[PDB]
Structures are given as C-alpha cells and as structure tokens.
Amino acid sequence: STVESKAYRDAMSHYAGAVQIVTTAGAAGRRGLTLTAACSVSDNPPTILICLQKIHEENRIFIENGVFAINTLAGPHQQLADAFSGRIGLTQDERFELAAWEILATGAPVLKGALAAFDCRVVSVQDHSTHHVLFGEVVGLSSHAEEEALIYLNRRYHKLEL
Amino acid sequence: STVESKAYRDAMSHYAGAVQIVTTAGAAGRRGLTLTAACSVSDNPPTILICLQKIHEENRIFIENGVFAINTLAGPHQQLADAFSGRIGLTQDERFELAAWEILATGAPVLKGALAAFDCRVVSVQDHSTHHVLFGEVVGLSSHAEEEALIYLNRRYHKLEL
Ligand SMILES: Cc1cc2nc3c(=O)[nH]c(=O)nc-3n(C[C@H](O)[C@H](O)[C@H](O)COP(=O)(O)OP(=O)(O)OC[C@H]3O[C@@H](n4cnc5c(N)ncnc54)[C@H](O)[C@@H]3O)c2cc1C
Ligand SMILES: Cc1cc2nc3c(=O)[nH]c(=O)nc-3n(C[C@H](O)[C@H](O)[C@H](O)COP(=O)(O)OP(=O)(O)OC[C@H]3O[C@@H](n4cnc5c(N)ncnc54)[C@H](O)[C@@H]3O)c2cc1C
Ligand SMILES: Cc1cc2nc3c(=O)[nH]c(=O)nc-3n(C[C@H](O)[C@H](O)[C@H](O)COP(=O)(O)OP(=O)(O)OC[C@H]3O[C@@H](n4cnc5c(N)ncnc54)[C@H](O)[C@@H]3O)c2cc1C
Ligand SMILES: Cc1cc2nc3c(=O)[nH]c(=O)nc-3n(C[C@H](O)[C@H](O)[C@H](O)COP(=O)(O)OP(=O)(O)OC[C@H]3O[C@@H](n4cnc5c(N)ncnc54)[C@H](O)[C@@H]3O)c2cc1C
C-alpha cells in the first residue's frame, strides 16, 4: 500500500520550482495557463515533456491542435501569473490583453521580454490516473538578458538574482 | 528539421532547478549521483519520474534492483554535491562516508537532515534517444524544518530563504 494524499502535499511544499506560462492555437481555438510540472528529456534531438489536469475539460484543446509553446518568467511579473491561474476573474481574450506577443514557426503565441522560449510539435500522448502526459520536439527559439527570475516555494512567490 | 544542440544548451542556462541526490541497493550492489531532471506526476496514487544518461554503463544497476530514493538538499551542502558529480576523485564507499544515513521500507539509503525525502518501487521503464525514463510509486516519507534551499542557475550554485 501507498502513503496518504494529504501527507504527500505537505512534504512537496519544501521542493522549489521555476514559474512558466504554456500556450496553443489552430482549428479548435486559442488558450493559456500557469504551470510548474515540466522537465528536459534529451539534447540530440532536443525534446521536452508537460503534465495537465483531467478535471478541467478545456485542456483537451491542446491534444486536438497538436502543437504547444513554453515561456520562462522574470522578476517583475507576478500580476500576469495571478491572471492565468484563475484567481481574479476575466475572459481568455481579456487575459492575453495584459502584455505584448509574436509568431515563430507553428502559430502558438510567444512572449516579448521573456528570459527564454521553446516552440514545439507533438510526437506522443499517454494516460496516468489524474493527469495526461505529452512529449514534444523543438522547432524554434529565443532568449534575452534580464537580471532576476520568478520562483514558487513554501506556499508563496520569491525573486532570485542571476 | 529541429534546432542545433549547442544553441539549445545556451537557452537552458536561463531555466532554474532545485538540487537532488538519488540512491539504490540490492543483489546488483549500492550506488549514488547528483541530479536536476525530475518532476511530480500525480497525487492519487502518489507517483514520480527521473531521467538517466546512457553513456555511463554503471547506471544499469538501478533497472536490475527495481527500487530508488530521492533526497532534497539544504543551504550548507555544496561539498556533498561536488563529490557525487565526480569532480574531485574517490571510490563510492569513500563518497557515502562524508555524512549520516537511515533505512525506511525498500533498503535504499535515506539522508539525515534533508529538507524532504521519498522512497519508491519501479512500475515502468522507457527508451528515449540519449536517456532512459523510469516511473515509481511512493511507499515511505520524511521531512525537517531548515531555513534555506540549494539551487543551480547561470552555470553556478546559490542559496534561497524559505
Ligand atoms: C504555482 C502553480 C502551479 C501550477 N501548476 C500546474 C500544473 O503543473 N498542471 C496543471 O494542470 N495545473 C497547474 N496549476 C493550476 C492551473 O493554473 C489552473 O487549474 C487553471 O488555470 C484553471 O483553468 P481555468 O481558469 O480556465 O478554470 P475555471 O476557473 O474553472 O474557469 C473556466 C473558464 O471560464 C471563463 N471565466 C472564468 N471567470 C470568468 C468571468 N468572471 N467572466 C467571464 N468568463 C470567465 C474563463 O474562460 C475560464 O478559462 C498551477 C497553479 C499554480 C498557482
Ligand atoms: C556536468 C553537467 C551535466 C548536466 N547534465 C544534465 C542532464 O543530463 N539533464 C538536465 O536536464 N540538465 C543537466 N545539467 C544542468 C543544466 O541543464 C546545464 O547547466 C545546461 O543545460 C547545459 O550547459 P552546461 O555547459 O552546463 O553542460 P555541459 O558541461 O556542456 O554538458 C555536460 C553533459 O550533460 C549533458 N547535458 C547538459 N545539459 C543538458 C540538458 N539540458 N538536457 C539533456 N542533457 C544535458 C551533455 O550532453 C553533456 O554530456 C548538467 C549540468 C552539468 C554541469
Ligand atoms: C547540476 C548538475 C545536474 C546534473 N543532472 C543530471 C541528470 O539529470 N541526469 C544525469 O544522468 N546526470 C546528471 N548530472 C551528471 C552526473 O552527476 C554525473 O554524470 C555522474 O555523477 C558521473 O558518474 P561517475 O562519477 O561514477 O562517472 P566516472 O567519472 O566516469 O567514474 C566512474 C567510477 O570510477 C570510480 N572512480 C573515479 N575516480 C576514482 C578515483 N580517483 N579512485 C578510485 N575510484 C575512482 C568511481 O566509482 C566512479 O563512480 C548532473 C550534474 C550536475 C553538476
Ligand atoms: C492551485 C494550485 C495548483 C497546483 N497544481 C499543481 C500540479 O498540478 N502539479 C504540481 O506538480 N504542482 C502543483 N502545484 C504546486 C505545488 O506542488 C503545491 O504548492 C503543493 O504540492 C500542494 O499544496 P497546495 O496546498 O498549495 O495545493 P492545493 O491548493 O491543496 O491543491 C490544488 C489542486 O492542485 C492539485 N495538486 C497540488 N499539488 C500537486 C502535486 N504536487 N502533484 C499533483 N497535483 C497537485 C490538487 O489535486 C488540487 O486539485 C499547485 C499549486 C497551487 C497553488
């Protein structure tokens, strides 16, 4: 037998993570959300994975379009993160209005003034209890030189110098 | 076509990660190493994944034993991390001598004075180009109240307050 759900979450509050915004576009429509469960798989050919909650049915739009982009956040941007987690109201079109964006290879929206960004095509989809897991290969890039990074730890937000 | 290997690594130097030590034991022997590519998959039942380099053949000992543990590091511990990345010499028995350890459910070594720890049984193994990916379910736990965490960013080490 496995350990209890509540006790697992209390221990994970001592494990730190860098804050992302992930996006999509195509015949099923345009969507974004705030996220921490992602990691690097290989550098030859370059490959990345992400994990999405099954209890929100609008997350099936990512699987139907077959493309996604991942954007890494800098020091001054706590207001953008609160909006894309659903804490303060608003329609999707009203959430995107808060900043400036550009296009690279696939159609998915890329953020101006990000620390880094990766534009991807889907190669595999798997089912794991409470979440779906998606694998993608990298077809476009950008990066800029800013002075601090945004981090989540012990149930609150922080800033850290490069 | 995909982007170039060297350009991918320069952009990933702007993406932060918390520092772990991962361990194993059984009929194929006892081993450890320093690591950043891991993440949380589900909370019902609790489940975690890890990624291991194919170019070092001693990493096949983890697959043969069928068990592993993951340990999260605190502020004062940069010397332990340098030893388990292979930067300063020593045999495996000589690396474990530098600190104190205990036993929970499987046999794999758990660290005294860690910020958090998770003891796991293997349920799935997959092949992805340069690395192997392993999935595990959680059968034991511990945690302690320390004041800072260890982080890797922009090709050097840092400290961050809880
Ligand atoms: C630090 C952190 C890390 C996270 N990591 C992950 C992760 O790894 N994986 C994951 O899956 N989730 C993660 N989440 C959670 C995720 O951000 C939310 O579940 C998600 O944003 C909720 O989607 P929603 O707002 O559209 O859903 P809902 O709140 O149910 O709303 C659905 C839709 O209704 C519309 N709507 C809502 N309010 C209004 C309004 N007042 N007026 C008009 N229209 C409205 C909007 O279009 C909205 O999208 C994380 C959250 C945080 C804070
Ligand atoms: C010695 C070393 C090894 C590392 N290995 C990994 C790793 O396996 N996975 C990971 O997510 N982070 C890894 N990192 C952390 C981080 O992602 C890197 O700092 C950065 O991406 C690569 O630049 P570098 O010059 O520090 O690595 P280098 O010194 O140029 O490379 C060391 C070795 O690790 C591999 N490697 C380095 N970065 C990655 C990566 N992002 N994804 C897959 N393989 C990589 C390379 O193929 C090489 O064999 C490693 C860091 C160091 C110092
Ligand atoms: C920040 C960071 C993140 C990383 N993330 C990852 C990751 O996600 N995934 C991953 O796979 N790797 C990662 N790495 C790299 C990983 O730590 C090393 O590849 C690994 O520790 C090397 O194994 P090794 O020392 O046993 O290999 P080797 O240097 O080739 O040595 C093999 C063995 O020989 C013996 N030996 C060596 N020297 C002596 C001596 N002088 N006297 C007697 N015996 C000796 C030891 O038993 C040693 O284990 C990361 C590294 C860093 C710095
Ligand atoms: C609203 C919110 C959602 C988050 N969702 C995720 C997530 O999906 N994946 C992730 O790795 N980190 C997630 N985190 C970040 C972090 O891992 C948590 O802060 C901590 O583990 C759980 O405690 P909590 O009280 O903040 O979450 P809660 O407010 O109690 O939970 C919010 C929701 O997210 C789910 N969830 C929370 N933590 C995890 C977890 N570690 N693994 C899987 N599901 C989780 C829960 O089932 C719940 O539906 C989330 C954080 C917030 C604030």
Is A155 annotated to bind ligand? yes
Distance CA B110, CA B134 (A): 19
- Residue whose CA is closest, atom 43 of ligand 4? B42
φ/ψ bin of B36: left (φ > 0), alpha (ψ from -120 to 50), beta (otherwise): alpha
Give, as one character, the DSSP assignment of residue A109: -
Q: How many Å apart are CA B8 and CA A43, to the nearest integer? A: 7
Contact list, A72 vs chain B (CB under 8 Å): 14-15
Residue type present at position B107: G
Q: Which experimental approach was used here? A: X-ray
- Contact check, Cβ <8 Å, B143/A14: yes
Whole-angstrom Cα distance, residue B84 to residue A5?
32
The experimental resolution of this structure, in angstroms, equals 2.2
- Encoded tokens for B82: 């340098």
Residue whose Cα lies nearest atom 35 of ligand 4: it is: B43
Q: Which residues contact B37 (CB under 8 A, 6 or more apart)?
A: A39, A40, A41, B50, B51
Q: Is A41 in the pocket of ligand 2 (CB under 6 A)?
A: no
Coarse DSSP helix, strand, coil percentages of chain A, rounded to the nearest 5 percent: 20, 45, 35
Backbone φ and ψ for B21, nearest 5 degrees, come out as: -120, 120
Q: Give me the phi and psi of B89, to 5 degrees please.
A: 80, -150
- Of the CA atoms within 13 Å of residue B143, those in its CB half-sphere come to 13
**Contact at 8 Å (CB) between A68 and A120?**
yes
In whole angstroms, what is the distance from residue A144 CA to residue B161 CA? 26
Put residue A143 in one of left, alpha, beta given phi > 0 → left and psi -120 to 50 → alpha: beta
HSE-CB at A17 with a 13 A cutoff on CA atoms is 19
Q: In this structure, are residues A110 and A103 in contact, taking their beta carbons and an 8 Å threshold?
A: yes
CA-nearest of A106, A37, A129 to B37 is A37
Going by alpha carbons, the residue nearest to atom 34 of ligand 4 is A53
Dist. CA B56 → ligand 3 center (Å): 8
Number of domains in chain B: 1
Q: Measuring CA to CA, how many Å separate B42 from each of A9, A36, A134, B135, B136?
A: 11, 13, 14, 11, 11
Locate the chain B residue with the closest alpha carbon to A160. Answer: B160
Distance separating the N- and C-terminal Cα atoms of chain A: 43
Sole residue written with tokens 């998959």: B41
Residue B3: domain span? 1-162
Strand partners, A25: none
Q: What is the CATH number of the domain that holds A51?
A: 2.30.110.10
Binding residues of B for FAD: 31, 34, 36-37, 40, 43, 51, 53, 84, 92, 95, 131, 155
Q: Are strands A156-161 and A101-102 parallel, antiparallel or unpaired?
A: unpaired
d(CA A54, CA A115): 30
Q: Which long-range contacts (CB under 8 A, 24 or more apart) does B90-98 make?
A: B92/B30, B92/B31, B92/B32, B95/B32, B96/B30, B96/B32
How do beta strands A101-102 and A110-111 pair?
A: antiparallel
User: Token digits for B92?
Assistant: 């495996």
